[PDB]
CSV table of C-alpha atoms in Angstrom, one decimal:
chain,number,residue,atom,x,y,z
Z,1,UNK,CA,4.9,27.1,-7.8
Z,2,UNK,CA,5.4,28.4,-11.4
Z,3,UNK,CA,9.2,28.3,-12.2
Z,4,UNK,CA,11.7,25.7,-11.1
Z,5,UNK,CA,11.7,22.6,-8.9
Z,6,UNK,CA,8.9,22.8,-6.2
Z,7,UNK,CA,10.8,23.6,-3.1
Z,8,UNK,CA,10.5,20.1,-1.4
Z,9,UNK,CA,12.1,18.5,-4.3
Z,10,UNK,CA,14.8,21.2,-4.5
Z,11,UNK,CA,15.5,20.4,-0.9
Z,12,UNK,CA,15.6,16.8,-1.8
Z,13,UNK,CA,18.4,17.4,-4.3
Z,14,UNK,CA,20.2,19.4,-2.0
Z,15,UNK,CA,20.1,16.7,0.7
Z,16,UNK,CA,21.4,14.4,-2.2
Z,17,UNK,CA,24.3,16.8,-3.0
Z,18,UNK,CA,25.1,17.6,0.6
Z,19,UNK,CA,26.2,14.0,1.4
Z,20,UNK,CA,29.3,12.3,-0.4
Z,21,UNK,CA,28.1,8.8,0.5
Z,22,UNK,CA,24.2,9.9,-0.6
Z,23,UNK,CA,25.6,11.7,-3.7
Z,24,UNK,CA,27.5,8.8,-5.2
Z,25,UNK,CA,24.7,6.4,-4.4
Z,26,UNK,CA,22.4,8.6,-6.5
Z,27,UNK,CA,25.0,8.3,-9.3
Z,28,UNK,CA,25.8,4.7,-9.2
Z,29,UNK,CA,22.1,3.6,-9.1
Z,30,UNK,CA,22.0,4.9,-12.8
Z,31,UNK,CA,25.1,3.1,-14.0
Z,32,UNK,CA,24.9,1.6,-17.5
Z,33,UNK,CA,23.2,3.0,-20.8
Z,34,UNK,CA,20.0,4.4,-19.5
Z,35,UNK,CA,16.7,6.2,-20.8
Z,36,UNK,CA,15.2,9.0,-19.0
Z,37,UNK,CA,15.9,9.3,-16.3
Z,38,UNK,CA,19.3,9.1,-16.8
Z,39,UNK,CA,20.8,10.9,-13.5
Z,40,UNK,CA,19.1,12.1,-10.3
Z,41,UNK,CA,18.9,15.5,-11.9
Z,42,UNK,CA,16.3,14.0,-14.4
Z,43,UNK,CA,14.6,12.2,-12.1
Z,44,UNK,CA,13.9,15.2,-9.7
Z,45,UNK,CA,12.7,17.0,-12.9
Z,46,UNK,CA,10.5,13.9,-13.4
Z,47,UNK,CA,9.0,14.3,-9.9
Z,48,UNK,CA,8.4,17.6,-10.4
Z,49,UNK,CA,5.7,16.9,-13.4
Z,50,UNK,CA,4.3,13.7,-11.8
Z,51,UNK,CA,3.6,15.6,-8.8
Z,52,UNK,CA,1.4,18.2,-10.2
Z,53,UNK,CA,-0.8,15.4,-12.2
Z,54,UNK,CA,-3.0,12.7,-10.8
Z,55,UNK,CA,-2.3,9.1,-11.9
Z,56,UNK,CA,-3.9,7.3,-14.9
Z,57,UNK,CA,-4.9,3.9,-15.6
Z,58,UNK,CA,-2.8,1.6,-17.7
Z,59,UNK,CA,0.6,0.7,-15.9
Z,60,UNK,CA,1.3,-2.0,-13.6
Z,61,UNK,CA,2.2,0.4,-10.7
Z,62,UNK,CA,1.7,3.9,-9.6
Z,63,UNK,CA,3.7,6.6,-11.5
Z,64,UNK,CA,6.5,6.9,-9.1
Z,65,UNK,CA,7.1,3.2,-8.7
Z,66,UNK,CA,7.2,3.1,-12.7
Z,67,UNK,CA,10.3,5.1,-12.8
Z,68,UNK,CA,12.0,4.2,-9.7
Z,69,UNK,CA,11.5,0.5,-10.3
Z,70,UNK,CA,15.0,0.3,-12.3
Z,71,UNK,CA,16.9,2.2,-9.3
Z,72,UNK,CA,15.3,0.0,-6.8
Z,73,UNK,CA,16.8,-2.9,-8.6
Z,74,UNK,CA,20.3,-2.1,-7.7
Z,75,UNK,CA,22.7,-2.7,-4.8
Z,76,UNK,CA,23.3,1.4,-4.9
Z,77,UNK,CA,19.7,2.1,-4.9
Z,78,UNK,CA,18.5,-0.3,-2.2
Z,79,UNK,CA,21.5,1.2,-0.1
Z,80,UNK,CA,20.0,4.8,-0.5
Z,81,UNK,CA,16.3,3.9,0.1
Z,82,UNK,CA,17.1,2.5,3.2
Z,83,UNK,CA,18.5,5.6,4.9
Z,84,UNK,CA,15.9,7.3,7.0
Z,85,UNK,CA,17.3,10.5,6.4
Z,86,UNK,CA,16.6,10.3,2.6
Z,87,UNK,CA,13.1,8.5,3.5
Z,88,UNK,CA,12.2,11.5,5.5
Z,89,UNK,CA,12.3,13.7,2.4
Z,90,UNK,CA,10.5,11.3,0.4
Z,91,UNK,CA,7.5,11.6,2.9
Z,92,UNK,CA,7.2,15.3,2.2
Z,93,UNK,CA,7.7,14.7,-1.4
Z,94,UNK,CA,4.5,12.3,-1.4
Z,95,UNK,CA,2.8,14.4,1.4
Z,96,UNK,CA,2.7,17.1,-0.9
Z,97,UNK,CA,1.7,15.0,-3.9
Z,98,UNK,CA,-1.1,14.1,-1.6
Z,99,UNK,CA,-2.3,17.8,-1.4
Z,100,UNK,CA,-2.9,18.1,-5.0
Z,101,UNK,CA,-4.4,14.8,-5.1
Z,102,UNK,CA,-6.8,15.9,-2.6
Z,103,UNK,CA,-7.8,19.1,-4.5
Z,104,UNK,CA,-10.7,19.4,-7.1
Z,105,UNK,CA,-7.8,19.9,-9.9
Z,106,UNK,CA,-7.0,16.1,-9.6
Z,107,UNK,CA,-10.4,15.2,-10.9
Z,108,UNK,CA,-9.4,15.6,-14.5
Z,109,UNK,CA,-8.4,12.1,-14.7
Z,110,UNK,CA,-11.9,10.9,-13.5
Z,111,UNK,CA,-13.0,10.6,-17.1
Z,112,UNK,CA,-13.5,8.2,-20.2
Z,113,UNK,CA,-11.0,10.0,-22.5
Z,114,UNK,CA,-8.2,7.7,-23.5
Z,115,UNK,CA,-5.3,9.9,-23.3
Z,116,UNK,CA,-2.9,7.2,-25.7
Z,117,UNK,CA,-2.9,3.8,-26.6
Z,118,UNK,CA,-1.6,2.7,-23.4
Z,119,UNK,CA,-3.4,5.2,-21.0
Z,120,UNK,CA,-7.1,6.0,-19.9
Z,121,UNK,CA,-8.7,7.8,-17.4
Z,122,UNK,CA,-10.5,5.8,-14.2
Z,123,UNK,CA,-14.0,6.3,-15.8
Z,124,UNK,CA,-13.4,5.0,-19.4
Z,125,UNK,CA,-15.4,1.4,-19.7
Z,126,UNK,CA,-11.7,-0.4,-19.6
Z,127,UNK,CA,-10.9,1.2,-16.2
Z,128,UNK,CA,-14.3,0.7,-14.9
Z,129,UNK,CA,-14.6,-3.1,-15.8
Z,130,UNK,CA,-11.4,-3.6,-14.0
Z,131,UNK,CA,-12.3,-2.3,-10.7
Z,132,UNK,CA,-15.7,-4.5,-10.5
Z,133,UNK,CA,-13.9,-7.9,-11.6
Z,134,UNK,CA,-15.1,-9.4,-8.3
Z,135,UNK,CA,-18.3,-8.2,-7.9
Z,136,UNK,CA,-20.5,-10.5,-9.6
Z,137,UNK,CA,-21.5,-9.0,-12.8
Z,138,UNK,CA,-22.6,-5.6,-10.9
Z,139,UNK,CA,-21.6,-2.4,-12.3
Z,140,UNK,CA,-19.1,0.2,-10.6
Z,141,UNK,CA,-21.7,2.8,-10.3
Z,142,UNK,CA,-23.7,-0.1,-8.2
Z,143,UNK,CA,-21.0,-1.4,-6.2
Z,144,UNK,CA,-19.3,2.0,-5.1
Z,145,UNK,CA,-21.1,5.3,-4.0
Z,146,UNK,CA,-21.2,7.9,-7.0
Z,147,UNK,CA,-23.0,9.7,-9.3
Z,148,UNK,CA,-22.9,8.2,-12.9
Z,149,UNK,CA,-24.7,11.1,-14.5
Z,150,UNK,CA,-22.4,13.6,-12.6
Z,151,UNK,CA,-19.0,14.8,-13.9
Z,152,UNK,CA,-16.3,12.8,-12.4
Z,153,UNK,CA,-18.8,10.5,-11.3
Z,154,UNK,CA,-19.6,13.0,-8.3
Z,155,UNK,CA,-16.1,12.3,-6.9
Z,156,UNK,CA,-14.3,15.8,-5.5
Z,157,UNK,CA,-10.8,14.6,-6.1
Z,158,UNK,CA,-8.5,11.9,-7.3
Z,159,UNK,CA,-8.3,10.9,-3.4
Z,160,UNK,CA,-12.1,10.8,-3.1
Z,161,UNK,CA,-12.1,8.3,-6.0
Z,162,UNK,CA,-9.4,6.0,-4.7
Z,163,UNK,CA,-11.2,6.0,-1.4
Z,164,UNK,CA,-14.5,5.3,-2.5
Z,165,UNK,CA,-17.0,3.8,-0.3
Z,166,UNK,CA,-19.2,0.9,-0.8
Z,167,UNK,CA,-22.6,1.7,-1.8
Z,168,UNK,CA,-24.4,-1.5,-0.2
Z,169,UNK,CA,-21.8,-3.4,1.3
Z,170,UNK,CA,-24.5,-5.6,2.9
Z,171,UNK,CA,-25.2,-7.0,-0.9
Z,172,UNK,CA,-21.6,-6.7,-2.3
Z,173,UNK,CA,-19.4,-7.5,0.6
Z,174,UNK,CA,-21.1,-8.9,3.4
Z,175,UNK,CA,-19.8,-9.3,6.9
Z,176,UNK,CA,-20.3,-13.1,6.5
Z,177,UNK,CA,-21.9,-15.0,9.3
Z,178,UNK,CA,-23.4,-11.7,10.8
Z,179,UNK,CA,-21.7,-9.1,13.2
Z,180,UNK,CA,-23.1,-11.0,16.2
Z,181,UNK,CA,-21.1,-14.2,15.7
Z,182,UNK,CA,-17.8,-13.4,17.4
Z,183,UNK,CA,-16.0,-16.9,16.1
Z,184,UNK,CA,-15.2,-15.5,12.8
Z,185,UNK,CA,-12.3,-13.0,11.7
Z,186,UNK,CA,-13.0,-10.9,8.5
Z,187,UNK,CA,-10.5,-9.7,6.0
Z,188,UNK,CA,-9.5,-5.9,6.8
Z,189,UNK,CA,-8.9,-5.1,3.2
Z,190,UNK,CA,-9.9,-6.0,-0.4
Z,191,UNK,CA,-7.2,-7.8,-1.7
Z,192,UNK,CA,-5.3,-11.1,-3.0
Z,193,UNK,CA,-3.7,-13.4,-0.9
Z,194,UNK,CA,0.1,-12.9,-0.6
Z,195,UNK,CA,1.6,-14.9,2.1
Z,196,UNK,CA,0.7,-17.2,5.3
Z,197,UNK,CA,3.3,-17.9,7.8
Z,198,UNK,CA,3.2,-20.5,10.7
Z,199,UNK,CA,5.1,-20.1,13.7
Z,200,UNK,CA,6.4,-16.9,12.9
Z,201,UNK,CA,9.6,-15.4,15.1
Z,202,UNK,CA,11.9,-12.9,15.2
Z,203,UNK,CA,15.4,-12.0,13.1
Z,204,UNK,CA,18.4,-10.1,14.4
Z,205,UNK,CA,19.2,-9.3,11.0
Z,206,UNK,CA,16.9,-9.2,7.6
Z,207,UNK,CA,19.4,-10.6,4.9
Z,208,UNK,CA,19.2,-14.1,3.8
Z,209,UNK,CA,17.1,-16.5,5.9
Z,210,UNK,CA,14.4,-16.7,3.8
Z,211,UNK,CA,13.4,-13.0,3.5
Z,212,UNK,CA,10.7,-13.9,6.2
Z,213,UNK,CA,8.6,-11.9,8.6
Z,214,UNK,CA,10.6,-10.8,11.9
Z,215,UNK,CA,8.1,-10.1,14.7
Z,216,UNK,CA,10.3,-7.7,16.4
Z,217,UNK,CA,11.1,-5.4,13.3
Z,218,UNK,CA,7.5,-5.9,11.9
Z,219,UNK,CA,5.8,-4.6,14.9
Z,220,UNK,CA,8.7,-2.2,15.8
Z,221,UNK,CA,9.5,-4.0,19.2
Z,222,UNK,CA,6.5,-3.3,20.6
Z,223,UNK,CA,6.0,-4.9,24.3
Z,224,UNK,CA,3.1,-7.0,22.9
Z,225,UNK,CA,5.4,-8.5,20.4
Z,226,UNK,CA,6.6,-11.7,22.9
Z,227,UNK,CA,2.8,-12.6,22.9
Z,228,UNK,CA,3.0,-13.1,19.1
Z,229,UNK,CA,5.8,-15.3,19.0
Z,230,UNK,CA,5.0,-18.9,17.7
Z,231,UNK,CA,1.7,-17.1,16.1
Z,232,UNK,CA,0.9,-16.9,12.3
Z,233,UNK,CA,0.5,-14.0,9.6
Z,234,UNK,CA,-1.8,-13.8,6.4
Z,235,UNK,CA,-0.6,-11.0,4.5
Z,236,UNK,CA,-2.6,-9.6,1.3
Z,237,UNK,CA,-2.1,-7.3,-1.8
Z,238,UNK,CA,-4.0,-4.4,-2.9
Z,239,UNK,CA,-4.1,-3.8,-6.6
Z,240,UNK,CA,-4.8,-1.0,-8.5
Z,241,UNK,CA,-8.3,-2.1,-9.2
Z,242,UNK,CA,-8.8,-2.6,-5.6
Z,243,UNK,CA,-11.0,-0.8,-2.7
Z,244,UNK,CA,-8.6,0.9,-0.6
Z,245,UNK,CA,-10.4,1.5,2.6
Z,246,UNK,CA,-9.6,-0.7,6.1
Z,247,UNK,CA,-12.6,-2.7,7.5
Z,248,UNK,CA,-12.3,-3.8,11.4
Z,249,UNK,CA,-11.4,-7.8,11.3
Z,250,UNK,CA,-13.4,-8.4,14.6
Z,251,UNK,CA,-15.7,-7.0,17.2
Z,252,UNK,CA,-13.3,-5.3,19.6
Z,253,UNK,CA,-11.4,-2.3,21.4
Z,254,UNK,CA,-8.7,-0.7,19.7
Z,255,UNK,CA,-5.5,-1.3,22.3
Z,256,UNK,CA,-2.7,0.6,20.4
Z,257,UNK,CA,-2.2,2.2,17.0
Z,258,UNK,CA,1.6,2.9,16.4
Z,259,UNK,CA,3.0,4.9,12.9
Z,260,UNK,CA,6.2,3.9,12.0
Z,261,UNK,CA,8.6,5.7,9.6
Z,262,UNK,CA,10.0,3.2,7.1
Z,263,UNK,CA,11.0,2.6,3.7
Z,264,UNK,CA,9.2,3.4,0.3
Z,265,UNK,CA,11.4,1.6,-2.1
Z,266,UNK,CA,13.1,-1.2,-0.5
Z,267,UNK,CA,12.8,-4.7,-2.3
Z,268,UNK,CA,14.2,-7.8,-1.1
Z,269,UNK,CA,18.0,-8.2,-1.4
Z,270,UNK,CA,17.7,-11.4,-3.2
Z,271,UNK,CA,16.0,-9.7,-5.8
Z,272,UNK,CA,18.4,-7.0,-6.8
Z,273,UNK,CA,19.3,-7.2,-10.7
Z,274,UNK,CA,16.3,-9.7,-11.3
Z,275,UNK,CA,14.6,-9.0,-14.7
Z,276,UNK,CA,11.7,-6.5,-14.5
Z,277,UNK,CA,8.8,-8.2,-16.7
Z,278,UNK,CA,7.4,-6.3,-19.7
Z,279,UNK,CA,4.6,-8.2,-19.6
Z,280,UNK,CA,1.3,-8.0,-17.2
Z,281,UNK,CA,1.7,-11.5,-15.7
Z,282,UNK,CA,4.8,-12.3,-14.2
Z,283,UNK,CA,5.8,-10.3,-11.0
Z,284,UNK,CA,8.4,-7.6,-10.8
Z,285,UNK,CA,11.1,-7.7,-8.1
Z,286,UNK,CA,9.5,-5.4,-5.8
Z,287,UNK,CA,6.1,-7.2,-5.9
Z,288,UNK,CA,8.1,-10.2,-4.9
Z,289,UNK,CA,9.4,-8.5,-1.7
Z,290,UNK,CA,5.9,-7.8,0.5
Z,291,UNK,CA,7.2,-10.2,3.2
Z,292,UNK,CA,10.5,-8.7,3.2
Z,293,UNK,CA,9.6,-4.8,3.3
Z,294,UNK,CA,6.6,-5.7,5.6
Z,295,UNK,CA,9.5,-5.4,8.2
Z,296,UNK,CA,10.8,-2.1,7.4
Z,297,UNK,CA,8.3,0.1,5.0
Z,298,UNK,CA,6.4,2.9,6.3
Z,299,UNK,CA,3.5,1.2,8.1
Z,300,UNK,CA,0.8,1.4,10.6
Z,301,UNK,CA,0.4,-1.0,13.5
Z,302,UNK,CA,-2.9,-1.7,15.2
Z,303,UNK,CA,-3.4,-3.8,18.3
Z,304,UNK,CA,-7.0,-4.9,18.9
Z,305,UNK,CA,-8.7,-6.6,21.7
Z,306,UNK,CA,-11.6,-9.2,20.1
Z,307,UNK,CA,-14.6,-9.2,22.4
Z,308,UNK,CA,-14.2,-12.9,22.1
Z,309,UNK,CA,-11.5,-13.8,24.2
Z,310,UNK,CA,-10.9,-16.9,22.5
Z,311,UNK,CA,-9.6,-14.8,19.8
Z,312,UNK,CA,-8.2,-12.0,22.1
Z,313,UNK,CA,-5.3,-9.7,21.3
Z,314,UNK,CA,-4.7,-9.6,17.3
Z,315,UNK,CA,-2.5,-7.3,15.3
Z,316,UNK,CA,-3.4,-5.4,12.0
Z,317,UNK,CA,-0.2,-4.4,10.1
Z,318,UNK,CA,-0.9,-1.6,7.3
Z,319,UNK,CA,1.9,-1.4,5.0
Z,320,UNK,CA,2.7,1.2,2.4
Z,321,UNK,CA,4.4,0.8,-1.0
Z,322,UNK,CA,6.2,3.7,-2.6
Z,323,UNK,CA,3.8,6.4,-3.1
Z,324,UNK,CA,0.9,4.9,-1.8
Z,325,UNK,CA,2.3,4.8,1.9
Z,326,UNK,CA,0.0,7.4,4.0
Z,327,UNK,CA,-2.1,5.1,6.7
Z,328,UNK,CA,-4.9,6.8,7.9
Z,329,UNK,CA,-6.7,5.2,11.0
Z,330,UNK,CA,-10.3,6.7,11.5
Z,331,UNK,CA,-10.7,5.2,14.9
Z,332,UNK,CA,-9.1,6.0,18.3
Z,333,UNK,CA,-7.3,4.0,21.0
Z,334,UNK,CA,-10.2,2.6,23.5
Z,335,UNK,CA,-13.0,2.7,20.6
Z,336,UNK,CA,-15.0,-0.3,20.2
Z,337,UNK,CA,-15.3,-1.5,16.6
Z,338,UNK,CA,-18.0,-3.8,15.5
Z,339,UNK,CA,-16.7,-6.2,12.6
Z,340,UNK,CA,-16.9,-4.8,9.3
Z,341,UNK,CA,-16.6,-1.2,10.5
Z,342,UNK,CA,-14.5,1.5,9.1
Z,343,UNK,CA,-11.2,1.3,10.5
Z,344,UNK,CA,-9.0,3.5,8.1
Z,345,UNK,CA,-7.7,3.7,4.8
Z,346,UNK,CA,-4.4,3.9,2.5
Z,347,UNK,CA,-3.8,7.3,0.7
Z,348,UNK,CA,-1.2,8.4,-1.9
Z,349,UNK,CA,1.3,10.1,0.5
Z,350,UNK,CA,4.5,9.3,2.7
T,1,UNK,CA,-0.8,-1.4,-0.5
T,2,UNK,CA,-0.3,-4.4,1.8
T,3,UNK,CA,-2.0,-5.3,5.2
T,4,UNK,CA,-0.9,-8.2,7.5
T,5,UNK,CA,-3.5,-9.8,10.1
T,6,UNK,CA,-1.3,-11.3,13.2
T,7,UNK,CA,-3.0,-13.9,15.2
T,8,UNK,CA,-1.4,-15.5,18.6
T,9,UNK,CA,-0.1,-19.0,19.3
T,10,UNK,CA,-2.7,-19.2,22.1
T,11,UNK,CA,-5.5,-18.1,19.7
T,12,UNK,CA,-7.2,-20.8,18.3
T,13,UNK,CA,-8.6,-19.2,15.4
T,14,UNK,CA,-7.2,-20.9,12.3
T,15,UNK,CA,-6.6,-19.4,8.9
T,16,UNK,CA,-9.0,-20.5,6.1
T,17,UNK,CA,-6.9,-22.9,4.2
T,18,UNK,CA,-7.2,-21.4,0.5
T,19,UNK,CA,-5.6,-18.3,1.7
T,20,UNK,CA,-2.4,-20.0,1.7
T,21,UNK,CA,-2.2,-20.1,-2.1
T,22,UNK,CA,-1.0,-16.7,-3.2
T,23,UNK,CA,-3.2,-14.8,-5.7
T,24,UNK,CA,-6.6,-16.3,-4.0
T,25,UNK,CA,-9.1,-13.4,-4.2
T,26,UNK,CA,-9.8,-11.8,-0.7
T,27,UNK,CA,-13.1,-10.3,-0.6
T,28,UNK,CA,-13.3,-7.5,2.2
T,29,UNK,CA,-15.4,-8.6,5.2
T,30,UNK,CA,-15.3,-12.5,4.1
T,31,UNK,CA,-13.9,-15.1,6.7
T,32,UNK,CA,-10.0,-15.3,6.8
T,33,UNK,CA,-9.9,-17.2,9.9
T,34,UNK,CA,-12.3,-18.9,12.3
T,35,UNK,CA,-12.4,-20.5,15.6
T,36,UNK,CA,-12.7,-24.5,15.1
C-alpha cells in the first residue's frame, strides 16, 4: 500500500483503541521521558517502515525487538504482551512482514554495502565472518550453498538467505557417530547452550518459583506430558549468526506436531525494570528469560518415537522470539526420520 | 530463536555434561545426549 499505515497495522491500532484497558496499557508502557517511539502512534508508524524493509546486520536483535525492548521492560508492557487477543494481531503483522521477506525485493540487504557506521548488508565481510565463526576456518560460500559470483550470492529473498542450507553437512556438521548408531541424540539446532534442567516438573502458576520450566505449560497440557515428569530438558539459543533450519535429533517416527499460539514480547517478570545493556556482551532482560517464555511463547511441539526403544518418546520444542516466531515443520506425522534429516526451520513471522 | 529437547525419566540417555554450562557452542548434529 502507498499512503498511510498498512491495513494490518491500522487494525492493530484500532484494536488498541477499542479496549480501554489495552489502550491504557499502551499509554502506561511509554511512561517517562522517551525517545522515538514516544507513544503507540509512533510505534505503529515505525512498524510501518520496518515491515517494508529487510533486517540488516549490526544490532543485537532483529528490528522489532530493538524498538520493543524498552516497552517489554515494564509492567504495563508485559501485561499487554500476555493478552492473547493482542498477540493474534502481532501474528498477522509478522505474517504479513514475512511475505515481503519471501519476495525478491528483500534481497537489497544481500549486499556488501555498509549502510552506516553501525550497520551493513549480509554479504559484507564483517557479516560473512560472523556467520562462519564455528566452522574451523572455512568460508561462508564453502559452508553454505550459494553462488559467491552471483548477485545476492544467488539467494531469492531474505528468507532464502535466513534459511540457507549446508553445502556439505558431512564435512562441516557431521552426524557424529553415523546415522546407524542409534544410541546418540544429535542437536536439532545450531545454537549456544542456554540451560539444562533435571527432574523437571509442572507448576500451577508461572510467577516466582525460579522462573523455571512447567511441563504442563510448555507442552500445552498434552496427554504425553505426564511421561515427561521427572525428566530433563536441554535448551539452546540461536543467534543472528546462526543456521536456522531444524535437523532430526534421532532416527524415529514423527508422532505428534502441535503449533501453540503464544506470546512474542513477554520477558520474565523478575527481570522487568532491569537495565538494558548498551554493550555487546552483557545479556538484556529478554535474553535472560528464555526458560521462562518457553512456557508461553509462540511455539511448535514435536513428539518423536526413537527407533531405539531405550530412548523412545522424546519431545522437541521450537520456541519463537519476537518477530522470529514462525515454526515450520517440513515433516509429517507418521513420517520416519533419520538423525540429521531436515525437520523444519524458523522464519520471520508469527 | 530457541529450541528445547526433552527426555523422559525412564530414558537412560544422558545429557552431555559440557552443555550444562550456558554459552557452550552447540554444533548442529553433534551429540547432546547418549546412552551410557
